[PDB]
mmCIF file of C-alpha atoms in Angstrom:
data_model
loop_
_atom_site.group_PDB
_atom_site.id
_atom_site.type_symbol
_atom_site.label_atom_id
_atom_site.label_comp_id
_atom_site.label_asym_id
_atom_site.label_seq_id
_atom_site.Cartn_x
_atom_site.Cartn_y
_atom_site.Cartn_z
ATOM 1 C CA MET A 1 0.620 11.057 13.496
ATOM 2 C CA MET A 2 -1.579 11.742 16.333
ATOM 3 C CA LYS A 3 -3.191 14.521 17.966
ATOM 4 C CA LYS A 4 -4.809 13.863 21.332
ATOM 5 C CA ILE A 5 -8.543 14.680 21.079
ATOM 6 C CA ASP A 6 -10.764 14.928 24.142
ATOM 7 C CA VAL A 7 -13.790 12.644 24.070
ATOM 8 C CA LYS A 8 -16.737 12.497 26.470
ATOM 9 C CA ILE A 9 -19.199 9.579 26.746
ATOM 10 C CA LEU A 10 -22.844 10.629 26.818
ATOM 11 C CA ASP A 11 -24.546 7.206 26.865
ATOM 12 C CA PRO A 12 -23.609 4.447 29.398
ATOM 13 C CA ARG A 13 -23.887 1.732 26.721
ATOM 14 C CA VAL A 14 -20.841 3.143 24.943
ATOM 15 C CA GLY A 15 -17.812 0.982 25.729
ATOM 16 C CA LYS A 16 -20.160 -1.586 27.401
ATOM 17 C CA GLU A 17 -22.625 -2.786 24.721
ATOM 18 C CA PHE A 18 -20.438 -1.635 21.780
ATOM 19 C CA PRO A 19 -16.902 -0.418 21.834
ATOM 20 C CA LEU A 20 -15.382 2.961 21.480
ATOM 21 C CA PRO A 21 -14.156 3.832 17.961
ATOM 22 C CA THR A 22 -10.726 2.512 17.073
ATOM 23 C CA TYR A 23 -8.501 2.558 13.951
ATOM 24 C CA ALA A 24 -8.689 -0.919 12.350
ATOM 25 C CA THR A 25 -4.998 -0.882 11.247
ATOM 26 C CA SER A 26 -2.121 1.524 11.751
ATOM 27 C CA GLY A 27 -2.454 2.707 8.118
ATOM 28 C CA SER A 28 -6.193 3.322 8.466
ATOM 29 C CA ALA A 29 -7.339 6.906 7.769
ATOM 30 C CA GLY A 30 -10.821 6.722 9.391
ATOM 31 C CA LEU A 31 -12.632 5.565 12.447
ATOM 32 C CA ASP A 32 -16.041 3.760 12.119
ATOM 33 C CA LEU A 33 -18.927 5.275 14.188
ATOM 34 C CA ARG A 34 -21.752 3.095 15.498
ATOM 35 C CA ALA A 35 -25.471 3.667 15.971
ATOM 36 C CA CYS A 36 -26.287 4.284 19.726
ATOM 37 C CA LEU A 37 -29.940 3.259 19.495
ATOM 38 C CA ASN A 38 -32.436 1.798 21.914
ATOM 39 C CA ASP A 39 -34.352 0.076 19.074
ATOM 40 C CA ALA A 40 -33.513 -0.803 15.473
ATOM 41 C CA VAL A 41 -34.715 1.823 12.935
ATOM 42 C CA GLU A 42 -36.148 0.793 9.542
ATOM 43 C CA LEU A 43 -35.493 3.209 6.648
ATOM 44 C CA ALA A 44 -37.726 2.984 3.605
ATOM 45 C CA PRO A 45 -36.231 4.196 0.299
ATOM 46 C CA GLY A 46 -35.880 8.001 0.533
ATOM 47 C CA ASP A 47 -36.193 8.287 4.331
ATOM 48 C CA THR A 48 -33.652 10.075 6.488
ATOM 49 C CA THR A 49 -33.146 9.698 10.277
ATOM 50 C CA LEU A 50 -30.764 11.348 12.735
ATOM 51 C CA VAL A 51 -28.772 8.741 14.707
ATOM 52 C CA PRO A 52 -27.004 9.500 17.952
ATOM 53 C CA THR A 53 -23.532 8.158 18.615
ATOM 54 C CA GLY A 54 -23.559 8.587 22.478
ATOM 55 C CA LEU A 55 -20.245 10.475 22.045
ATOM 56 C CA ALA A 56 -19.006 14.100 21.980
ATOM 57 C CA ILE A 57 -15.517 15.296 20.936
ATOM 58 C CA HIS A 58 -13.682 18.536 21.493
ATOM 59 C CA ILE A 59 -11.010 19.018 18.831
ATOM 60 C CA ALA A 60 -9.951 22.357 20.304
ATOM 61 C CA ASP A 61 -7.109 23.096 17.753
ATOM 62 C CA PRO A 62 -8.498 25.401 14.996
ATOM 63 C CA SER A 63 -6.024 23.933 12.522
ATOM 64 C CA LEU A 64 -7.935 20.584 12.552
ATOM 65 C CA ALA A 65 -11.482 19.571 11.586
ATOM 66 C CA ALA A 66 -13.182 16.160 11.313
ATOM 67 C CA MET A 67 -15.288 14.993 8.368
ATOM 68 C CA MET A 68 -17.976 12.302 8.520
ATOM 69 C CA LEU A 69 -18.444 10.172 5.365
ATOM 70 C CA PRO A 70 -20.497 7.138 4.331
ATOM 71 C CA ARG A 71 -18.999 3.650 4.833
ATOM 72 C CA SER A 72 -18.046 2.411 1.364
ATOM 73 C CA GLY A 73 -19.842 -0.932 1.217
ATOM 74 C CA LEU A 74 -22.933 0.188 2.927
ATOM 75 C CA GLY A 75 -23.152 3.230 0.613
ATOM 76 C CA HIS A 76 -22.410 1.387 -2.627
ATOM 77 C CA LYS A 77 -24.158 -1.883 -1.923
ATOM 78 C CA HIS A 78 -27.164 -0.859 0.263
ATOM 79 C CA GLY A 79 -27.615 2.827 -0.595
ATOM 80 C CA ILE A 80 -27.037 3.815 3.065
ATOM 81 C CA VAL A 81 -25.318 7.208 3.001
ATOM 82 C CA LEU A 82 -25.446 10.590 4.816
ATOM 83 C CA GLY A 83 -28.365 12.981 4.355
ATOM 84 C CA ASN A 84 -26.069 16.024 4.447
ATOM 85 C CA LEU A 85 -23.587 13.985 2.177
ATOM 86 C CA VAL A 86 -20.474 14.933 4.143
ATOM 87 C CA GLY A 87 -20.629 16.129 7.773
ATOM 88 C CA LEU A 88 -18.088 18.700 8.918
ATOM 89 C CA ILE A 89 -17.186 18.970 12.699
ATOM 90 C CA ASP A 90 -15.550 22.286 13.765
ATOM 91 C CA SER A 91 -12.776 22.530 16.344
ATOM 92 C CA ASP A 92 -15.182 24.258 18.715
ATOM 93 C CA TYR A 93 -18.227 21.912 18.350
ATOM 94 C CA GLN A 94 -18.753 20.144 21.665
ATOM 95 C CA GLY A 95 -22.189 18.650 21.348
ATOM 96 C CA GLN A 96 -23.082 15.024 20.691
ATOM 97 C CA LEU A 97 -21.956 13.629 17.281
ATOM 98 C CA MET A 98 -25.193 12.945 15.417
ATOM 99 C CA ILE A 99 -25.298 11.151 12.081
ATOM 100 C CA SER A 100 -27.732 12.131 9.328
ATOM 101 C CA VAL A 101 -28.604 8.790 7.650
ATOM 102 C CA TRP A 102 -30.383 8.699 4.294
ATOM 103 C CA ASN A 103 -31.546 5.636 2.304
ATOM 104 C CA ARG A 104 -30.686 6.684 -1.257
ATOM 105 C CA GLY A 105 -31.445 3.132 -2.496
ATOM 106 C CA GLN A 106 -34.482 1.206 -3.736
ATOM 107 C CA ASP A 107 -34.856 -1.122 -0.745
ATOM 108 C CA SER A 108 -35.759 -0.695 2.933
ATOM 109 C CA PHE A 109 -32.884 -1.176 5.328
ATOM 110 C CA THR A 110 -32.918 -1.594 9.102
ATOM 111 C CA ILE A 111 -30.188 -0.001 11.217
ATOM 112 C CA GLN A 112 -29.380 -2.217 14.193
ATOM 113 C CA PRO A 113 -28.257 -0.902 17.587
ATOM 114 C CA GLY A 114 -24.408 -0.851 17.551
ATOM 115 C CA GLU A 115 -24.001 -1.141 13.753
ATOM 116 C CA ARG A 116 -21.153 0.770 12.106
ATOM 117 C CA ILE A 117 -22.918 3.346 9.913
ATOM 118 C CA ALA A 118 -20.361 6.099 9.047
ATOM 119 C CA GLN A 119 -16.652 6.787 9.200
ATOM 120 C CA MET A 120 -14.841 9.902 10.436
ATOM 121 C CA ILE A 121 -11.431 11.335 9.410
ATOM 122 C CA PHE A 122 -9.420 14.202 10.970
ATOM 123 C CA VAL A 123 -7.910 16.603 8.364
ATOM 124 C CA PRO A 124 -5.862 19.812 8.688
ATOM 125 C CA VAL A 125 -7.920 22.951 7.703
ATOM 126 C CA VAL A 126 -6.657 26.440 6.865
ATOM 127 C CA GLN A 127 -8.604 29.639 7.677
ATOM 128 C CA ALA A 128 -8.529 32.045 4.703
ATOM 129 C CA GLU A 129 -7.729 35.758 5.226
ATOM 130 C CA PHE A 130 -9.397 37.413 2.153
ATOM 131 C CA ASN A 131 -7.331 39.985 0.205
ATOM 132 C CA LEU A 132 -9.831 41.952 -1.902
ATOM 133 C CA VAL A 133 -8.502 42.742 -5.366
ATOM 134 C CA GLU A 134 -10.412 44.246 -8.336
ATOM 135 C CA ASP A 135 -8.558 42.052 -10.804
ATOM 136 C CA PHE A 136 -6.365 38.937 -10.518
ATOM 137 C CA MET B 1 4.400 19.356 -3.498
ATOM 138 C CA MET B 2 4.783 15.813 -4.303
ATOM 139 C CA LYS B 3 4.931 12.610 -2.656
ATOM 140 C CA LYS B 4 5.996 9.627 -4.742
ATOM 141 C CA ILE B 5 3.166 7.046 -4.726
ATOM 142 C CA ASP B 6 3.654 3.513 -6.011
ATOM 143 C CA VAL B 7 1.230 2.492 -8.742
ATOM 144 C CA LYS B 8 0.708 -0.927 -10.327
ATOM 145 C CA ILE B 9 -1.116 -1.558 -13.631
ATOM 146 C CA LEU B 10 -3.642 -4.385 -13.492
ATOM 147 C CA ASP B 11 -5.107 -4.175 -17.017
ATOM 148 C CA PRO B 12 -2.906 -4.130 -20.189
ATOM 149 C CA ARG B 13 -5.136 -1.502 -21.841
ATOM 150 C CA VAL B 14 -4.024 1.080 -19.286
ATOM 151 C CA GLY B 15 -1.445 3.384 -20.865
ATOM 152 C CA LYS B 16 -2.209 1.781 -24.294
ATOM 153 C CA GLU B 17 -5.919 2.396 -25.035
ATOM 154 C CA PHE B 18 -6.243 5.278 -22.516
ATOM 155 C CA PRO B 19 -3.541 7.061 -20.644
ATOM 156 C CA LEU B 20 -2.421 6.950 -17.097
ATOM 157 C CA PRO B 21 -3.861 9.695 -14.851
ATOM 158 C CA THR B 22 -2.067 13.019 -15.012
ATOM 159 C CA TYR B 23 -2.570 16.478 -13.437
ATOM 160 C CA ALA B 24 -4.059 18.765 -16.127
ATOM 161 C CA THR B 25 -2.120 21.866 -14.916
ATOM 162 C CA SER B 26 0.500 22.459 -12.250
ATOM 163 C CA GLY B 27 -2.129 24.143 -10.021
ATOM 164 C CA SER B 28 -4.568 21.246 -10.394
ATOM 165 C CA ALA B 29 -5.609 19.547 -7.127
ATOM 166 C CA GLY B 30 -7.054 16.302 -8.601
ATOM 167 C CA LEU B 31 -6.377 13.592 -11.081
ATOM 168 C CA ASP B 32 -9.218 12.301 -13.372
ATOM 169 C CA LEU B 33 -9.797 8.484 -13.309
ATOM 170 C CA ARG B 34 -11.125 6.654 -16.364
ATOM 171 C CA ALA B 35 -13.467 3.706 -16.813
ATOM 172 C CA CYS B 36 -11.458 0.490 -17.684
ATOM 173 C CA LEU B 37 -14.352 -1.330 -19.346
ATOM 174 C CA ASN B 38 -14.631 -3.951 -22.042
ATOM 175 C CA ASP B 39 -18.090 -2.670 -23.087
ATOM 176 C CA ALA B 40 -19.999 0.564 -22.503
ATOM 177 C CA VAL B 41 -22.406 0.403 -19.509
ATOM 178 C CA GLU B 42 -25.839 2.086 -19.630
ATOM 179 C CA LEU B 43 -27.151 3.445 -16.303
ATOM 180 C CA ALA B 44 -30.868 4.063 -15.979
ATOM 181 C CA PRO B 45 -31.940 6.709 -13.433
ATOM 182 C CA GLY B 46 -31.239 5.289 -9.947
ATOM 183 C CA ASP B 47 -28.858 2.501 -11.026
ATOM 184 C CA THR B 48 -25.405 2.045 -9.555
ATOM 185 C CA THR B 49 -22.483 0.056 -11.059
ATOM 186 C CA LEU B 50 -18.950 -0.645 -9.848
ATOM 187 C CA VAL B 51 -16.352 0.390 -12.462
ATOM 188 C CA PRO B 52 -12.797 -0.872 -12.467
ATOM 189 C CA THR B 53 -9.918 1.479 -13.159
ATOM 190 C CA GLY B 54 -7.273 -1.222 -14.065
ATOM 191 C CA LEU B 55 -5.013 0.471 -11.465
ATOM 192 C CA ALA B 56 -3.883 -0.108 -7.850
ATOM 193 C CA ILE B 57 -1.964 2.368 -5.640
ATOM 194 C CA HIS B 58 -0.005 1.923 -2.455
ATOM 195 C CA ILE B 59 0.164 5.202 -0.537
ATOM 196 C CA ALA B 60 2.189 3.618 2.261
ATOM 197 C CA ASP B 61 2.577 6.833 4.415
ATOM 198 C CA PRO B 62 -0.140 6.820 7.147
ATOM 199 C CA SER B 63 -0.135 10.613 7.173
ATOM 200 C CA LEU B 64 -1.757 10.669 3.675
ATOM 201 C CA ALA B 65 -5.074 9.393 2.294
ATOM 202 C CA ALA B 66 -6.755 9.807 -1.113
ATOM 203 C CA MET B 67 -10.381 10.815 -1.657
ATOM 204 C CA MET B 68 -12.438 10.028 -4.763
ATOM 205 C CA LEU B 69 -15.088 12.615 -5.759
ATOM 206 C CA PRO B 70 -17.515 13.148 -8.643
ATOM 207 C CA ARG B 71 -16.344 15.165 -11.679
ATOM 208 C CA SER B 72 -18.107 18.529 -11.444
ATOM 209 C CA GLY B 73 -19.766 18.773 -14.852
ATOM 210 C CA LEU B 74 -20.767 15.211 -15.075
ATOM 211 C CA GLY B 75 -22.275 15.380 -11.560
ATOM 212 C CA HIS B 76 -24.080 18.694 -12.001
ATOM 213 C CA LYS B 77 -25.119 18.386 -15.616
ATOM 214 C CA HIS B 78 -25.742 14.609 -16.068
ATOM 215 C CA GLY B 79 -26.377 13.425 -12.502
ATOM 216 C CA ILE B 80 -23.390 11.030 -12.696
ATOM 217 C CA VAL B 81 -21.926 10.854 -9.188
ATOM 218 C CA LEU B 82 -20.529 8.261 -6.726
ATOM 219 C CA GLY B 83 -22.789 5.725 -5.019
ATOM 220 C CA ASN B 84 -20.826 5.960 -1.759
ATOM 221 C CA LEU B 85 -20.718 9.850 -2.324
ATOM 222 C CA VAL B 86 -17.041 10.220 -1.431
ATOM 223 C CA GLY B 87 -14.591 7.287 -1.586
ATOM 224 C CA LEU B 88 -11.767 7.181 0.943
ATOM 225 C CA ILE B 89 -8.514 5.200 0.121
ATOM 226 C CA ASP B 90 -6.348 4.265 3.161
ATOM 227 C CA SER B 91 -2.553 4.292 3.127
ATOM 228 C CA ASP B 92 -2.560 0.508 3.390
ATOM 229 C CA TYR B 93 -5.202 -0.311 0.696
ATOM 230 C CA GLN B 94 -3.459 -2.115 -2.150
ATOM 231 C CA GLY B 95 -6.289 -3.553 -4.165
ATOM 232 C CA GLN B 96 -7.660 -2.279 -7.463
ATOM 233 C CA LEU B 97 -9.267 1.220 -7.353
ATOM 234 C CA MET B 98 -12.946 0.599 -8.064
ATOM 235 C CA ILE B 99 -15.430 3.408 -8.613
ATOM 236 C CA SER B 100 -19.004 3.234 -7.325
ATOM 237 C CA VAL B 101 -21.033 5.073 -10.016
ATOM 238 C CA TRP B 102 -24.621 6.137 -9.365
ATOM 239 C CA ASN B 103 -27.054 7.881 -11.759
ATOM 240 C CA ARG B 104 -28.775 10.345 -9.418
ATOM 241 C CA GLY B 105 -30.439 12.055 -12.424
ATOM 242 C CA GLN B 106 -33.640 11.648 -14.438
ATOM 243 C CA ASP B 107 -32.049 10.373 -17.655
ATOM 244 C CA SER B 108 -30.169 7.224 -18.695
ATOM 245 C CA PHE B 109 -26.480 7.722 -19.308
ATOM 246 C CA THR B 110 -23.965 5.409 -20.963
ATOM 247 C CA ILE B 111 -20.417 5.179 -19.614
ATOM 248 C CA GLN B 112 -17.968 4.637 -22.465
ATOM 249 C CA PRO B 113 -14.739 2.641 -22.151
ATOM 250 C CA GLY B 114 -11.957 5.144 -21.250
ATOM 251 C CA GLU B 115 -14.269 7.994 -20.154
ATOM 252 C CA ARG B 116 -13.174 10.165 -17.227
ATOM 253 C CA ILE B 117 -15.760 9.433 -14.519
ATOM 254 C CA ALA B 118 -14.281 10.575 -11.145
ATOM 255 C CA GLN B 119 -11.424 12.614 -9.754
ATOM 256 C CA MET B 120 -9.030 11.761 -6.917
ATOM 257 C CA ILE B 121 -7.138 14.080 -4.513
ATOM 258 C CA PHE B 122 -4.396 13.244 -1.968
ATOM 259 C CA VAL B 123 -4.891 14.976 1.435
ATOM 260 C CA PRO B 124 -2.938 14.834 4.716
ATOM 261 C CA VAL B 125 -4.872 12.904 7.472
ATOM 262 C CA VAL B 126 -4.261 12.899 11.227
ATOM 263 C CA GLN B 127 -4.885 9.848 13.460
ATOM 264 C CA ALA B 128 -6.676 10.887 16.677
ATOM 265 C CA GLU B 129 -5.458 9.605 20.080
ATOM 266 C CA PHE B 130 -8.642 9.872 22.261
ATOM 267 C CA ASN B 131 -8.272 11.470 25.723
ATOM 268 C CA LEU B 132 -11.379 10.445 27.684
ATOM 269 C CA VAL B 133 -12.713 13.252 29.860
ATOM 270 C CA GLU B 134 -16.013 13.353 31.815
ATOM 271 C CA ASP B 135 -16.510 17.025 31.037
ATOM 272 C CA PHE B 136 -14.952 19.489 28.567
ATOM 273 C CA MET C 1 -3.803 29.611 10.629
ATOM 274 C CA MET C 2 -4.338 31.777 7.736
ATOM 275 C CA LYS C 3 -3.349 32.060 4.281
ATOM 276 C CA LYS C 4 -4.218 35.282 2.479
ATOM 277 C CA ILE C 5 -6.461 34.448 -0.511
ATOM 278 C CA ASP C 6 -7.247 36.990 -3.212
ATOM 279 C CA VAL C 7 -10.950 37.595 -3.763
ATOM 280 C CA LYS C 8 -12.666 39.631 -6.479
ATOM 281 C CA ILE C 9 -16.293 40.846 -6.350
ATOM 282 C CA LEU C 10 -18.250 40.225 -9.540
ATOM 283 C CA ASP C 11 -21.702 41.487 -8.487
ATOM 284 C CA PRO C 12 -22.257 44.963 -6.902
ATOM 285 C CA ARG C 13 -24.809 43.556 -4.429
ATOM 286 C CA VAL C 14 -22.064 41.601 -2.675
ATOM 287 C CA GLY C 15 -21.089 43.398 0.531
ATOM 288 C CA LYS C 16 -24.102 45.764 0.043
ATOM 289 C CA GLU C 17 -27.262 43.594 0.042
ATOM 290 C CA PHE C 18 -25.566 40.611 1.769
ATOM 291 C CA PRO C 19 -22.189 40.447 3.367
ATOM 292 C CA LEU C 20 -18.965 38.909 2.322
ATOM 293 C CA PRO C 21 -18.277 35.434 3.770
ATOM 294 C CA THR C 22 -16.831 35.397 7.263
ATOM 295 C CA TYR C 23 -15.865 32.685 9.795
ATOM 296 C CA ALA C 24 -18.610 32.570 12.466
ATOM 297 C CA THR C 25 -16.140 31.822 15.326
ATOM 298 C CA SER C 26 -12.372 31.555 15.551
ATOM 299 C CA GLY C 27 -12.641 27.735 15.772
ATOM 300 C CA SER C 28 -14.889 27.532 12.708
ATOM 301 C CA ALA C 29 -13.549 25.398 9.828
ATOM 302 C CA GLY C 30 -15.848 26.695 7.032
ATOM 303 C CA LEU C 31 -17.249 29.813 5.527
ATOM 304 C CA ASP C 32 -20.975 29.967 4.490
ATOM 305 C CA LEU C 33 -21.640 31.050 0.844
ATOM 306 C CA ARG C 34 -24.826 32.896 -0.101
ATOM 307 C CA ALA C 35 -27.059 32.825 -3.164
ATOM 308 C CA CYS C 36 -26.431 35.962 -5.380
ATOM 309 C CA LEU C 37 -29.807 35.879 -7.125
ATOM 310 C CA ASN C 38 -32.044 38.483 -8.685
ATOM 311 C CA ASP C 39 -35.179 36.413 -7.918
ATOM 312 C CA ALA C 40 -35.928 33.522 -5.568
ATOM 313 C CA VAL C 41 -35.653 30.074 -7.245
ATOM 314 C CA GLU C 42 -38.108 27.261 -6.414
ATOM 315 C CA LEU C 43 -36.696 23.709 -6.571
ATOM 316 C CA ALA C 44 -39.135 20.841 -6.926
ATOM 317 C CA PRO C 45 -37.982 17.447 -5.589
ATOM 318 C CA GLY C 46 -35.204 16.192 -7.904
ATOM 319 C CA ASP C 47 -34.414 19.537 -9.576
ATOM 320 C CA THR C 48 -30.932 21.001 -9.731
ATOM 321 C CA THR C 49 -29.978 24.660 -10.411
ATOM 322 C CA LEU C 50 -26.634 26.442 -10.686
ATOM 323 C CA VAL C 51 -26.444 29.424 -8.292
ATOM 324 C CA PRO C 52 -23.954 32.232 -8.669
ATOM 325 C CA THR C 53 -22.152 33.628 -5.653
ATOM 326 C CA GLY C 54 -21.047 36.998 -7.245
ATOM 327 C CA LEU C 55 -17.502 36.108 -6.070
ATOM 328 C CA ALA C 56 -14.260 34.716 -7.564
ATOM 329 C CA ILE C 57 -11.171 33.551 -5.615
ATOM 330 C CA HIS C 58 -7.609 32.925 -6.661
ATOM 331 C CA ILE C 59 -5.933 30.497 -4.262
ATOM 332 C CA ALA C 60 -2.670 30.614 -6.207
ATOM 333 C CA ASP C 61 -0.679 28.200 -3.898
ATOM 334 C CA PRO C 62 -0.798 24.662 -5.420
ATOM 335 C CA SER C 63 -0.491 23.158 -1.951
ATOM 336 C CA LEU C 64 -4.051 24.359 -1.083
ATOM 337 C CA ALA C 65 -7.503 23.605 -2.516
ATOM 338 C CA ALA C 66 -11.017 24.568 -1.363
ATOM 339 C CA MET C 67 -13.953 22.171 -1.051
ATOM 340 C CA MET C 68 -17.625 23.166 -1.182
ATOM 341 C CA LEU C 69 -20.040 21.076 0.942
ATOM 342 C CA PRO C 70 -23.731 21.167 1.865
ATOM 343 C CA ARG C 71 -24.796 23.111 4.988
ATOM 344 C CA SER C 72 -25.667 20.491 7.605
ATOM 345 C CA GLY C 73 -29.178 21.536 8.607
ATOM 346 C CA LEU C 74 -30.327 22.431 5.199
ATOM 347 C CA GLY C 75 -29.017 19.097 3.845
ATOM 348 C CA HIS C 76 -30.384 16.909 6.635
ATOM 349 C CA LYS C 77 -33.626 18.708 7.337
ATOM 350 C CA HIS C 78 -34.671 20.083 3.890
ATOM 351 C CA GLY C 79 -32.793 17.814 1.472
ATOM 352 C CA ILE C 80 -30.929 20.822 -0.004
ATOM 353 C CA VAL C 81 -27.488 19.559 -1.020
ATOM 354 C CA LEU C 82 -24.987 19.883 -3.915
ATOM 355 C CA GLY C 83 -25.661 18.301 -7.306
ATOM 356 C CA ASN C 84 -21.993 17.362 -7.753
ATOM 357 C CA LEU C 85 -22.007 16.270 -3.975
ATOM 358 C CA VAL C 86 -18.693 17.932 -3.130
ATOM 359 C CA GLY C 87 -17.234 20.777 -5.230
ATOM 360 C CA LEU C 88 -13.464 21.007 -5.556
ATOM 361 C CA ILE C 89 -11.804 24.433 -6.384
ATOM 362 C CA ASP C 90 -8.225 24.229 -7.785
ATOM 363 C CA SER C 91 -5.483 26.705 -6.918
ATOM 364 C CA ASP C 92 -5.593 28.017 -10.476
ATOM 365 C CA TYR C 93 -9.414 28.377 -10.902
ATOM 366 C CA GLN C 94 -10.219 32.070 -11.220
ATOM 367 C CA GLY C 95 -13.761 32.109 -12.482
ATOM 368 C CA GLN C 96 -16.910 32.865 -10.510
ATOM 369 C CA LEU C 97 -17.742 30.374 -7.693
ATOM 370 C CA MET C 98 -20.952 28.691 -8.828
ATOM 371 C CA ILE C 99 -22.924 26.331 -6.614
ATOM 372 C CA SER C 100 -24.663 23.240 -7.988
ATOM 373 C CA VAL C 101 -27.835 22.950 -5.846
ATOM 374 C CA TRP C 102 -29.924 19.778 -5.874
ATOM 375 C CA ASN C 103 -33.196 19.071 -4.006
ATOM 376 C CA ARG C 104 -32.669 15.461 -2.909
ATOM 377 C CA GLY C 105 -35.800 15.664 -0.699
ATOM 378 C CA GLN C 106 -39.534 15.057 -1.098
ATOM 379 C CA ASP C 107 -40.663 18.684 -0.841
ATOM 380 C CA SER C 108 -40.239 21.820 -2.966
ATOM 381 C CA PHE C 109 -37.933 24.419 -1.497
ATOM 382 C CA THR C 110 -37.403 28.039 -2.512
ATOM 383 C CA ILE C 111 -33.917 29.556 -2.398
ATOM 384 C CA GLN C 112 -34.117 33.216 -1.403
ATOM 385 C CA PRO C 113 -31.702 35.893 -2.630
ATOM 386 C CA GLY C 114 -28.874 36.129 -0.029
ATOM 387 C CA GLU C 115 -29.597 32.793 1.709
ATOM 388 C CA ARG C 116 -26.643 30.747 2.958
ATOM 389 C CA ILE C 117 -26.735 27.592 0.813
ATOM 390 C CA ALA C 118 -23.274 25.908 1.054
ATOM 391 C CA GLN C 119 -20.094 26.057 3.081
ATOM 392 C CA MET C 120 -16.481 26.100 1.873
ATOM 393 C CA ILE C 121 -13.292 24.852 3.608
ATOM 394 C CA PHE C 122 -9.624 25.306 2.589
ATOM 395 C CA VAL C 123 -7.536 22.088 2.928
ATOM 396 C CA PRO C 124 -3.890 21.277 2.126
ATOM 397 C CA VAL C 125 -3.565 18.985 -0.989
ATOM 398 C CA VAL C 126 -0.562 16.941 -2.118
ATOM 399 C CA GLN C 127 0.275 16.282 -5.799
ATOM 400 C CA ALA C 128 1.241 12.616 -6.317
ATOM 401 C CA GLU C 129 4.350 11.695 -8.365
ATOM 402 C CA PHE C 130 3.537 8.104 -9.548
ATOM 403 C CA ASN C 131 6.285 5.462 -9.162
ATOM 404 C CA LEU C 132 5.281 2.570 -11.439
ATOM 405 C CA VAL C 133 6.003 -0.815 -9.887
ATOM 406 C CA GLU C 134 4.939 -4.271 -11.172
ATOM 407 C CA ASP C 135 4.324 -5.531 -7.655
ATOM 408 C CA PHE C 136 3.960 -3.880 -4.229
#
């Protein structure tokens, strides 16, 4: 229920110090993304930080998009979610996948190099052709 | 535009004290989920709580996933949203549907037993097969 | 990869003072929505406001829904996101598209008339037919 998606590695630690993203089970809908950091980053309550993944994708098919969402436990239990809430990746975006991380909780939290911090899903998207009407 | 989805009832009050989820209209995209609580829960500004639904689903088809989102009025007018922002349910998750509720507002809010507190949609998902390239 | 969607203009400034929504590129997944305001609105940290778009859509096909999400830069860099996090538009909703805007940041921000403040995507949705089982 695949679609081949081209991926390029931007940081030499990817696949060496921490693995490439993989589906945990065959019924899994998302892939976990990990923090490609040189040093751990401490987020006080309310802070946001942009975390690199060391990866770039090229979806290429305009009928597909990817969405980045918070990991469920981390968001619910530690208040570690995305600063833009939900990240949308277009079929033509070819830059590095960067994760906006926001501490919406009451406690400081430290992101460690290689920690899984977000999940990404691939969903079909439709481009609307607007038909202007004066009344429905 | 259905797909039959297996559902199991975990709490005897479901369908008795509050009904099973149903689509409001035939053009409705989501189903409202209700709080299966013994007692009302009061959320001060900033608090989060995990609310049981008394329900479990088994999507089973790996081409489909479900997403849980805030109810629009409650989120915009009362600041009652999800602590993990958007909840993703995999085709192989078979445990109880649990809702992470967060009061992102300035006022306390009390969740009453049986109140509709989130909505869920079923969307097609694609599993990516990564093709490693050195350049796009 | 279109679907024709009926659109009705509710405010005479739309298409005159600021253009109708358009896909930036042919591989773009979302459309940016702009604030249809008479006066700029200043949001202090924590405030929410409901912003009209001057537009109404009628999806009409029950197999499609639209989702409204924060713009990535504005959400990550200025803390300007949606108060209901993610807005869902049903195939039968025919009222004006209204955007719940929340300042989740630490600074005040002023929304100017015509500014792009959210993005919308059209995604296929499936209506579940529940099959009650006592065990999976």
